[model samples]
Target: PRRAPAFPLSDIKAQMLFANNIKAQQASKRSFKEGAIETYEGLLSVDPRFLSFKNELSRYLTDHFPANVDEYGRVYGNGVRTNFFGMRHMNGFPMIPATWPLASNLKKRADADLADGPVSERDNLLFRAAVRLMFSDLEPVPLKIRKGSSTCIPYFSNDMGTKIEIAERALEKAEEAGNLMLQGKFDDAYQLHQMGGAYYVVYRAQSTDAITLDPKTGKFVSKDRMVADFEYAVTGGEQGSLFAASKDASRLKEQYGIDVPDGFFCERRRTAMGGPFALNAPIMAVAQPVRNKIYSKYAYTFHHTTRLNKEEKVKEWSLCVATDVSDHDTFWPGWLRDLICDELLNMGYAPWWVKLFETSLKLPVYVGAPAPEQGHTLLGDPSNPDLEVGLSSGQGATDLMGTLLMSITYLVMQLDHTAPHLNSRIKDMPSACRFLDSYWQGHEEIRQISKSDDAMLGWTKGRALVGGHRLFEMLKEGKVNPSPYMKISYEHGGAFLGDILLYDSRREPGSAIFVGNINSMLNNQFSPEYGVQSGVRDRSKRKRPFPGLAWASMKDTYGACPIYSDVLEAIERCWWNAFGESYRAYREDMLKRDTLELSRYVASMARQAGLAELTPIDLEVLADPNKLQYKWTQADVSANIHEVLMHGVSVEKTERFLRSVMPR
Candidate 1:
């Protein structure tokens, strides 16, 4: 899809100005150069700081720049390349191969880990040549990795016959692509192998208790029977049905002169969206009449494998990742490890912290809790560092809430790299995140215990979740001013606690809120595709479902976004600094307080930059402290704030005080 600049330059200026004033007021005043950097630096100050951030940032930018020296040069930041169906099939890999050092960061250590193995010269040469080609300007860019999954079976397509054919075709093409490199004829191989993706599908039927809707009370009921499975698959589609691009679903069909059967519509098989889809279906009784049909559903599992012939020999190497899209650090693919080794260490964070955050963030992926041995002890044990960060499927998927937590942390980390002013604020970010981890445990524990019905609890539930009840009791008897960071993390975790507890997007739109329609609706905050696709203008006269619901529920509600005008006007403000009387008051109010202006300034810059920014709902939560279960400076939601707060720690137990805080 085509995109224009997020806002015009003038409105960007107002956002810049608001942010600058905040920075000036917070610390000793400092003059700023005009434009977005003003807001960037302003927000940068409020978050945790890292030493060597500037040095690492220089390396970060030098290594992470526009890919092709063109206007459309590729720049990456936690990018997702998945289907609208909500699978993580196309989530990992290169935008432009060489630029993504995530692939090569562990090459040295990886070899060391396999130092006692044996190898064949020809195959080893091939491996070396392959590794070199991945980072070279080679025409085909030997990008060897699975890209997607089956597209012809039920629930995202999983026919075994199709699976065998797809894998065979892939191996054949990979061999052909490999031979071209052997003969130094990469271009022809590139052209011949231009099939943009590939796949491997597996179907397994297992019995487990799955949640179903209770017809009586608009709540979830658990049922044990023929439910849930390891119906997993893989793909690397460059041009076939399982291709990465959403547009490819139709384009590939047309390119190959294929047609959908009369009764079946050509639906896009996107991502792992089954749970949400099941939840929403029962409650959509009020939905407008429309065409509905049997839908395709699919799931994927990512693995990073390194196979060696014998001691000191490395023969095969590849990467795969699908579970926990939002939690990058937990899955130590070479690329992820590379990211942690290079950038994360420089900023004082590590992969384990990321994994820790993932498990502690919410409930179970393996029912009730993670395996007892894998349970989080919060002890930082090197020998038993509890790598299993469970909580997958429904509550764990990266829908709106998961996206928010991960995005907020990511942006902070980026600022840690770019802004030097933050270095002295905190000695290390691992401690900051640890504080946050401990700080928000109440909400995490609440969700872990509550399972799926917390949504029924609502904001009223937040009073206790936010420790409002605890605070009230503490105050009733004695006095204690809580640590500011702990209080803030509560807001961080609590703001979304309401989401899983009382306001799941699934209760109305099923997983469509996650995969297709509702997910589409919420992202309207980014661009107008959802807004236009929503057909809100044409359907205003008709009754719409989920219109009065506090959040997104269905396709039609995309245009009915509660923050619609507020957001549109905010986008306009970003474009021209144009102010209506109401916004004038809003802007004036933001500028009036140093703290408020700082937060708004961070929010504005993040929005303008097209990285993640606080949504209207987040702003709504932040606006009222009474509504505020936790509070944050704008930096928490600012871009790359995570880098600032998570850097410089190594997994080795025998290290600095910071390094020893958590074990490998």
Candidate 2:
């Protein structure tokens, strides 16, 4: 070179000249055509019409670029050189494009080159040109400063980031409130109050500092501190017992910071029973007509047989009835048992025949029906040894016989201490008899039971008796103190029946609670009874009385007793309050949770899309049915391009058309 070389220049300058020459060659229109063809091929892969022309394109590519085609029929190689126009600088770096697969392929190559070493200038320029061709139709979206000194990146917005951070904080606060609730500190988490003494514990489900949306303003506003509260009673104690009161108080205070007054509580005492006394004659007279019909239909015969044991001869005879009656009918069985006892006694049977028959022919009498009272006369006196009458509790004749037996046992046990003189005769008499005797004889126990009119009227009385027994057991076990005034209420989910039992310790305590179980001495079988009243013939069309009407009726029946007058109204008010509060609180809490979840979902999707700011409205627009398919991203375009290429649409004509239209 120092010796006057033909192209006199320094070694560095000569190298630069060589590089520039190669760059110019790489910028040939032919390279542009190649690039355009590659992009077109990419587009066709995802096009629905690609399959129609795929075979023709594959054949063209195979014939024109056999060297570039692989065994799998896929075309390869870049359309332009990497060194062209200093595009080498952009090589070995991934670029965003309309098609995902093409972008992915570019990314894969860039990564490989990066892993190996610095990328070659030729490959780098070619990669830039390919990305440029794929995104030629789209205008670049410019990034802007979101806030003070903060620039928007591809999918990141400072404003959206801050909003997401705030949402996360809100979620954390909600979780804190939930944790407090789990720890039995509901008062700390939400607004709480004690309503109507110790019977109700009410609390709001929302957090103490929760915010809510204003439907009128369409904006989030500070939630009203005066939100409705969820009300519930502590149901831990035994059903139908006074212990429920104390237990409820303890739980209310422990969970919701509710304090119950000491004076509001009271102790239970075994009190005296009181009611009017009447002879069984009236009850029998009312039932006589029904008995006549039953007796006329009743017929029986005796079977006689002889059995020889060793050298002794034995004679046995068994009574058989000609008419069959269902065991379910307590009335029929009670009648038959009485008749058998009478016939055996008149036939000169042993004195113990009453006992034998009593043990052998077990029966129940409908406690609510007039038949039991009339049958009582035929069975003889409760104290009679010759023919002891057997009376079991019945309600509609469908009650389990075992359950009836248990009731008698419980009644006898209670009477053993209260009235032993009556305990011996209690089993042989109807429940009405025991109830009446206890009422008039100054027995110190009382029961008042009432049920909803949804079931058979007779069954309602029976259920009252059964439930009364359960209450008595609780009292006897000392688990609950009998309050002078207490209301044990039951609601079966607004369907079927509801029950309310009122206890008055100051009343003459002769089992007034079970008075409903007694056949009314004032009414005949056809008369309006305890639960049945004159009403519309259609049961469905009948107008139901107000809730606690049964209590009112009982109060009127025993007007002289010391029953609480305002208690029924109080119960109804408290029930509705608690129900309404619970419903509102649950609904608001559900809405709050739903809103929070939606916010979280929007934030997540924004991050995925590299967006700086996003809102529920933006999501809604993007999800619009009309625009959903048109909302393609750079990745989506690149993916489609790659798919087009995979289908073998790499012909010269396609390349030429793309080159004619595409810019250098």
Relative to the unseen true structure, what is the Cα RMSD of model 1? 29.5
Assess every candidate by TM-score: 0.20, 0.16
Q: What is the lDDT of candidate 2?
A: 0.21
Candidate 1, residues 536-558: lDDT per residue as tens digits? Answer: 23221111211221131222223
Best model per lDDT? 1
The 0-to-1 C-alpha lDDT of every candidate, in the order given, reads 0.22, 0.21
**Which whole-number lDDT from 0 to 100 does residue 404 have in model 2?**
27
lDDT for model 1 comes to 0.22
